[PDB]
Amino acid sequence: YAGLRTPAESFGSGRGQAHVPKQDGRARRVPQAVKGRSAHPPKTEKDRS
Amino acid sequence: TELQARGLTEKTPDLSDEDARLLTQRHRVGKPQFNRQDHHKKKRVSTSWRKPRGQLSKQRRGIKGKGDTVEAGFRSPTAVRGKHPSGFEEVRVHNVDDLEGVDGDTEAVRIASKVGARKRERIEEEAEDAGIRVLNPTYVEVEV
Amino acid sequence: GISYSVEADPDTTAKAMLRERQMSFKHSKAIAREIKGKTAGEAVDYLEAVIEGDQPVPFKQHNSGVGHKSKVDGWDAGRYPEKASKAFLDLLENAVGNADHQGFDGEAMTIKHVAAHKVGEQQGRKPRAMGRASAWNSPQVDVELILEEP
Amino acid sequence: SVAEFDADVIVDARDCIMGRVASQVAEQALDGETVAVVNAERAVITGREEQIVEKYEKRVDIGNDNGYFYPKRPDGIFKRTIRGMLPHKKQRGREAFESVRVYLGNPYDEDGEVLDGTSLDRLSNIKFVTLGEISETLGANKTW
RNA sequence: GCUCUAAUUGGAUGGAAGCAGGGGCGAGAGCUCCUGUGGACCGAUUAGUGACGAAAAUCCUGGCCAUAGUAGCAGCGAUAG
RNA sequence: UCAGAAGGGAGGCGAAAUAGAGCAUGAAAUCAGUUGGCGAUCGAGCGACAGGGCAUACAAGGUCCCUUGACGAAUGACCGAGACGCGAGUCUCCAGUAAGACUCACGGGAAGCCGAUGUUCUGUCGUACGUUUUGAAAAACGAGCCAGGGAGUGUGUCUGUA
Ligand SMILES: [Cl-]
Numbered sequence A: 001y002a003g004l005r006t007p008a009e010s011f012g013s014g015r016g017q018a019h020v021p022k023q024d025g026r027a028r029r030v031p032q033a034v035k036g037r038s039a040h041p042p043k044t045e046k047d048r049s
Numbered sequence B: 001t002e003l004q005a006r007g008l009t010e011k012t013p014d015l016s017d018e019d020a021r022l023l024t025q026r027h028r029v030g031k032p033q034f035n036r037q038d039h040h041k042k043k044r045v046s047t048s049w050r051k052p053r054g055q056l057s058k059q060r061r062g063i064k065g066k067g068d069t070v071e072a073g074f075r076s077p078t079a080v081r082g083k084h085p086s087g088f089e090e091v092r093v094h095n096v097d098d099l100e101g102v103d104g105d106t107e108a109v110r111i112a113s114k115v116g117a118r119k120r121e122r123i124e125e126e127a128e129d130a131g132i133r134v135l136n137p138t139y140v141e142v143e144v
Numbered sequence C: 001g002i003s004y005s006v007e008a009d010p011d012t013t014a015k016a017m018l019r020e021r022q023m024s025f026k027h028s029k030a031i032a033r034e035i036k037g038k039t040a041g042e043a044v045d046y047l048e049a050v051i052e053g054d055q056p057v058p059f060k061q062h063n064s065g066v067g068h069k070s071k072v073d074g075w076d077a078g079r080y081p082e083k084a085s086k087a088f089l090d091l092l093e094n095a096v097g098n099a100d101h102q103g104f105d106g107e108a109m110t111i112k113h114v115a116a117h118k119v120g121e122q123q124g125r126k127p128r129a130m131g132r133a134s135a136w137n138s139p140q141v142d143v144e145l146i147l148e149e150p
Numbered sequence D: 001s002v003a004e005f006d007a008d009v010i011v012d013a014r015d016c017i018m019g020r021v022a023s024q025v026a027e028q029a030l031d032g033e034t035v036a037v038v039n040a041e042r043a044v045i046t047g048r049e050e051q052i053v054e055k056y057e058k059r060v061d062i063g064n065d066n067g068y069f070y071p072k073r074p075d076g077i078f079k080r081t082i083r084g085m086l087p088h089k090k091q092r093g094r095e096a097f098e099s100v101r102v103y104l105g106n107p108y109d110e111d112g113e114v115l116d117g118t119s120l121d122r123l124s125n126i127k128f129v130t131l132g133e134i135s136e137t138l139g140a141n142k143t144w
Numbered sequence E: 001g002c003u004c005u006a007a008u009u010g011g012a013u014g015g016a017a018g019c020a021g022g023g024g025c026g027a028g029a030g031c032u033c034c035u036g037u038g039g040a041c042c043g044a045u046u047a048g049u050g051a052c053g054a055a056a057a058u059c060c061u062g063g064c065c066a067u068a069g070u071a072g073c074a075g076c077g078a079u080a081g
Numbered sequence F: 001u002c003a004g005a006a007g008g009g010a011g012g013c014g015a016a017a018u019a020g021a022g023c024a025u026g027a028a029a030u031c032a033g034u035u036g037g038c039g040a041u042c043g044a045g046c047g048a049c050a051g052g053g054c055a056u057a058c059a060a061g062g063u064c065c066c067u068u069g070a071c072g073a074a075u076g077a078c079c080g081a082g083a084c085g086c087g088a089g090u091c092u093c094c095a096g097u098a099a100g101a102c103u104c105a106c107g108g109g110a111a112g113c114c115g116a117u118g119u120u121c122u123g124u125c126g127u128a129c130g131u132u133u134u135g136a137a138a139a140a141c142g143a144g145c146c147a148g149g150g151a152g153u154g155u156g157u158c159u160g161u162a
C-alpha cells in the first residue's frame, strides 16, 4: 500500500494543469509523483529459489 | 631549482613501417565530434551520443550540416586502434607486480590515479629500470 | 553570505562588509558601479548629494520606465535611491574607520573593489483576489568594499 | 561626392549599355579594382522608351513605411544597377560596392576608357534612351 | 553504464568517493589521466542480482532567471490635515 | 567601529573556519564583480565540416611549417612543329611525358609553436527537438530554465527456444 493511502483525485481539464491526482494541492499516488507508489517494485511473492 | 619528470619521458616505441603509417593516418584523418543532436541548443541535453530517433529528425535523415551519425565506416585502423598518440600500447598499473611482463619497447605504463605517492615512487623507479616509460610521471624538484 | 571575492594586501588595503541588508539589490548594483574608483571621501560626498536629490545615480541595467536625468552623462536614466545610499554610507563609515585605526588616511583611499550580492529573500505573502495569495518579498544584500592606498 | 576618388579604372559610360557596363564593373570591383563610372547621364538603355519609363516610374512609385528608396538621378540609378550585381549585404560585396562610384560628367582630368562589348552604335539604333532622359522624366533636377 | 551478492584479486590519510577545470583513447554507449577542491572510503576480472540508464508525458517535487524596480499601496458622499 | 547583546574591522582557537552555528561535501539553473573574444552599418534553429584572426603557466597530448629530393593511383597538359575547319576550335607528334593526393629522407625553421581549448571571421550545407500526420519550420500538440524523481513487474498455466 505504499503511496496508495490517499484519496487524491485528478481535477481533469480546465485549470491549465496536467491531469494528476492531487490532495491538498500536492500530487499523489502515481509513479511519476514524489511520494507516489513504486510502479514495478520488488515483491515478496516472487520465487527466489 | 627546476621541475623534472621521473623516468624515460622521451622514449618512443619501435613500430613496423605499416603501423607507423596507420598511426600517421589515424592522426591525419581524425573524426567528427559525434556529439548528440542539438546538445548545444538545450542545457539539459548533454553531449553524450544518442542515436537520433525522431521520425523527422534532420540528423537522422542525414541532412548535410546536421552532423554525422555514428557508423562502422568511421572506425580507426585495426593495427593502430587504441594506441596512445606516441604509438605505445597502454598498460594500466596499480602496483609493482603489474610491471611484470610489460615490454617497454612496445608498451608504456599508466599508473592509476588512485595509487598514492609512496607506491608511485616505487613503481616509477622499477619502471625506469625495466626500460618502461611512465605516461603520467611525478615531477620532482631538481637543480638548474 | 559572501566572502571577499578579490584578494587584498593587508598592508596597502582596508576592508568592510554589509550583511543581509533589506534594501533594493538593483539599486545597490547601480550605486556600487558608480562609486567604484572614487575616493572614500568623494563617494561619501556623492552619496549625500544623491540623498539630497542633487545627484542622480545612473540606472544602466534596471531602467524600465525610468525617467531621463539631465545630470546623467553618457547615459539617460537615473534615480535617487536614498535607502541603499544610506547603507553604503554606513559601509563607507566602517571602512574609513577601520582604515584610520590601521594608521591610513581613510578618506583619501581609493575604492578598489565594491560589489553587491543578493544573498537571499525575506519571504512574504500578499493576499490577492479570488482566494489566492502571491509572493511579496524583501531582497537581502551583502556588499563588499576594499579600500586601497594611492 | 566631390571627394577625389582614386580609381584603378575610369570607365566612360557615354553611349554605352548600362547593364553590360554594370556587369563588368561589378566583376572588376569583386576582383579588387577601384572603379569610377563617368558620364552616367549619357549612358544608354535599349528598347521602347515608353515601357522603359513605366518600369522606372513604378520603382519610384512603390514603397511604404519600411520604404523602397529608388534613385531618380542618373548617377544614383547606375549605382543601384551595379548594387544588384553584387552580394552587397555580404562583407566582400559591400567592400566591392564601396570601391565603385558613378559620376555625372567627368570630374577627372583623363578621359575614361570604353569597355569592350558595351558600346552602342547610334547609326544602327533608334530605340533606346539616355539615363539623363529617364531622370528628367522621373522629375530629377537636371544638374548635368 | 548503474546497484548490491559471491569467488579471485587490487587501490587509499605519502589522500578514497564526489565535484570543477583541463589532457589522452574508443565509430559509440563510455573508459582513463592531470590540476584544484574534498577528507573516507574505492575498484578490477568472473559468475550472479535488479526499485538499472530520460529532453519530452498541460509529467512530479524543489530551486531559480526574465517579466520588474513594473501592476497595486488613487477611485467608495468619510478627499484631512 | 556602530544607535547597537546587530553587523563590520582587527584578533584568538583548530589539521581545516571557504568546519562559525539549518555549520561534511557543496553540481546545475542563476546573480555580483572580473578575464578573453566579438561589439552601437546591420539579419534570425544558435550548428556540422573546412579554413583564417585574437587569447593560452605547468601537468596530463607533441607535433607543425618551408626549400629540395625519393615514391607516385585515377587523371593528365602548356609551348613548339605538321595537318584540318567559314569560324569558335580540332587532329597528329612531343607523351601516358611534365604534372599528380598520401607517405618518407636530407637540410633549414616555429615553443602560443602544432594539436587542443575559448571566442570571432570566411566558405559550403542548414526553417529545433519529440509527437500526431498521406504531408510538420508550421498559423497542428507539449515544454520558462536546471537538478532530482518518473513507465515490460509477480504468480499460475500453456507454447517455443538455447
Ligand atoms: Cl565493430
Ligand SMILES: [Cl-]
Pocket (backbone or CB within 6 Å): C025, C026, C118, C139
Ligand atoms: Cl532583485
Ligand SMILES: [Cl-]
Pocket (backbone or CB within 6 Å): C026, C029, C030, C058, C059, C060, C061, C062, C063
Ligand atoms: Cl541599474
Ligand SMILES: [Cl-]
Pocket (backbone or CB within 6 Å): D062, D063, D064, D065, D066, D067, D068, D069
Ligand atoms: Cl518608400
Ligand SMILES: [Cl-]
Pocket (backbone or CB within 6 Å): D086, D087, D088, D089, D090, D093
Ligand atoms: Cl548580399
Ligand SMILES: [Cl-]
Pocket (backbone or CB within 6 Å): D124, D125, D126, D127
Ligand atoms: Cl532601333
Ligand SMILES: [Cl-]
Pocket (backbone or CB within 6 Å): B021, B025, F102, F103
Ligand atoms: Cl599513407
Ligand SMILES: [Cl-]
Pocket (backbone or CB within 6 Å): F070, F105
Ligand atoms: Cl628519400
Ligand SMILES: [Cl-]
Pocket (backbone or CB within 6 Å): F152
Ligand atoms: Cl519490454
Ligand SMILES: [Mg+2]
Pocket (backbone or CB within 6 Å): A002, A003, A035, A036, A037, A038
Ligand atoms: Mg514512497
Ligand SMILES: [Mg+2]
Pocket (backbone or CB within 6 Å): B032, B033, B034, B035
Ligand atoms: Mg568526441
Ligand SMILES: [Mg+2]
Pocket (backbone or CB within 6 Å): B038, B039, B040, B041, B042, B043, B044, B045, B046, B047
Ligand atoms: Mg547542452
Ligand SMILES: [Mg+2]
Pocket (backbone or CB within 6 Å): B112, B113, B114, B115, B116, B117
Ligand atoms: Mg595519485
Ligand SMILES: [Mg+2]
Pocket (backbone or CB within 6 Å): B136, B137, B138
Ligand atoms: Mg599523479
Ligand SMILES: [Mg+2]
Pocket (backbone or CB within 6 Å): C064, C065, C066, C067
Ligand atoms: Mg515611467
Ligand SMILES: [Mg+2]
Pocket (backbone or CB within 6 Å): C130, C131
Ligand atoms: Mg475570500
Ligand SMILES: [Mg+2]
Pocket (backbone or CB within 6 Å): E008, E009, E045, E046
Ligand atoms: Mg578474478
